[PDB]
A and B are shown apart, each in its own frame.
With several copies, the nearest count.
Chain A
Amino acid sequence: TLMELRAQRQQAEAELKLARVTYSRQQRLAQTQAVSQQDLDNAATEMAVKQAQ
């Protein structure tokens, strides 16, 4: 069972990388006012979700 969770955590570890890189990749353009503040709220919150996971 511990091995099972040992892998299942490894999944979320990857998704957290995806959401985080996507977030910084949004903000770096967002200093030049990227695609509204809407997507920034669509990115920062997902990262909080992957963080909680």
Chain B
Amino acid sequence: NTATAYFNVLNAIDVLSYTQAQKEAIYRQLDQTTQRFNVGLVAITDVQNARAQ
């Protein structure tokens, strides 16, 4: 149990950081798409899509 619980923390750290990087990536994805709507290239629906992401 000791060893198991020990490793679990590591794994959690891992997923944490990764999910973080994903966060930033998707974030500037949304920013790009947003600006793209601002110049009017695309439908609002995509904006809401990236929003949901």
Answer yes or no: A and B touching, Cβ < 8 Å: yes
- Whether the Cβ atoms of A29 and B36 lie closer than 8 Å is yes
Q: Is the interface of A mostly helix, strand, loop or mixed?
A: loop
Residues of chain A contacted by B35 (CB below 8 angstroms): 29, 32, 34
Kindly identify, within residues 20 to 52 of chain A, every residue whose CB is under 8 Å from any CB belonging to chain B.
Answer: 25-26, 28-29, 32-38
Q: Which residue of B lies closest to A27 (CB)?
A: B39
- Size of chain B's interface in residues, with CB distance under 8 A? 12
- Whether the Cβ atoms of A36 and B38 lie closer than 8 Å is no
List chain B positions with a Cβ less than 8 A from chain A.
Answer: 31-32, 35-44
24 A-B pairs whose Cβ atoms sit less than 8 Å apart in the complex: A25-B39, A25-B40, A25-B41, A28-B38, A28-B39, A29-B32, A29-B35, A29-B38, A29-B39, A29-B41, A32-B31, A32-B32, A32-B35, A33-B32, A33-B43, A33-B44, A34-B32, A34-B36, A36-B37, A36-B41, A36-B42, A37-B40, A38-B40, A38-B42
